Amino acid sequence: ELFTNNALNLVIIFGSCAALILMSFWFRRGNRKRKGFLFHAVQFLIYTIIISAVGSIINYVIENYKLKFITPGVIDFICTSLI
């Protein structure tokens, strides 16, 4: 079910929530009102963890549900191409 898949998804949904919290902290910037380069770099690479995460999430969700929508290896290809 949802709770069983979330028990399988323990190592990814918590990381997605923590990265959304980090993005919300970056909305108030977490510090003085300043913008730079490594600011934008750490603003970038907290997205790639959640996109690899939701790739693993949809791998678990197609193992849970049906396979009417076949070929997921190109889906992990496209999820990394989005990054």
Added chain:
Amino acid sequence: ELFTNNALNLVIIFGSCAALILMSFWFRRGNRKRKGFLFHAVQFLIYTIIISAVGSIINYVIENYKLKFITPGVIDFICTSLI
């Protein structure tokens, strides 16, 4: 049947219809009356998705129907050579 193969072909026939819609939008150009380079580039690479798509389609259709017309690996070779 046709509906069962189309249920197997859900991730490709919708992409073919959407790319034909994008080509029809490019017929009216989707914007002001102008032609360029990236116009012609995106006019190109919406064809390679439907040709790889119909390669997957004929893979499913030879899994559905007979194999009186043997050797399909060279058929995916020729479908990419057309691109």
